[PDB]
Amino acid sequence: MEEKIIQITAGRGPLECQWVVAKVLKTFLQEATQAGISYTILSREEGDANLTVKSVTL
RNA sequence: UGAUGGGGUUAGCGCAAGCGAAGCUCUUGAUCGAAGCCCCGGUAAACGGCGGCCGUAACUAUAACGGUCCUAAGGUAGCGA
Ligand SMILES: [Mg+2]
Ligand SMILES: [Mg+2]
Ligand SMILES: [Mg+2]
Ligand SMILES: [Mg+2]
């Protein structure tokens, strides 16, 4: 068994990048569920609007 | 309560194994037989009991929601380390 830590970030990117971090996160979890890798969130970095995330650590 | 049935006895009859009248007596328990119980409803300010699992919301989180399993019904208001 392996445990790892990864971060998905918008860097210095604009709000669109801040938003795609969220969409990519949702897809990433919707794949981790089928892969059987349990996922937990350590630091969700909410973005500059609704529904945005600057970065999230899994 | 005592119907039938099966015995025990013996007057008689039998070469004689045996049959057995009536009476008496032993046993059997047909029929009758109410409550109760089973049965059918009521009743919890009667004694009492008052559920599981799983998923689910433009972001993560939670589940308003949904699926099926069971129950007699799944803890209402209110309160809650
Ligand atoms: Mg999602
Ligand atoms: Mg009632
Ligand atoms: Mg309540
Ligand atoms: Mg305390």
Structure method: cryo-EM
Resolution at which this structure was determined, Å: 2.8
Nearest Cα neighbor of A26 from A44, A3, A14 is A44
SS (H, E, C) A1-58: CCCCCCEEECCCCCHHHHHHHHHHHHHHHHHHHHHCCCCCCCEEEECCCCCCEEEEEC
- Measured CA A12 to C1' B66 distance, in angstroms: 41
Chain B nucleotides with an atom closer than 7 Å to a protein C-beta: 58-61
User: Which amino acid is present at A30?
Assistant: Q
Contact between A18 and A52 (Cβ < 8 Å): yes
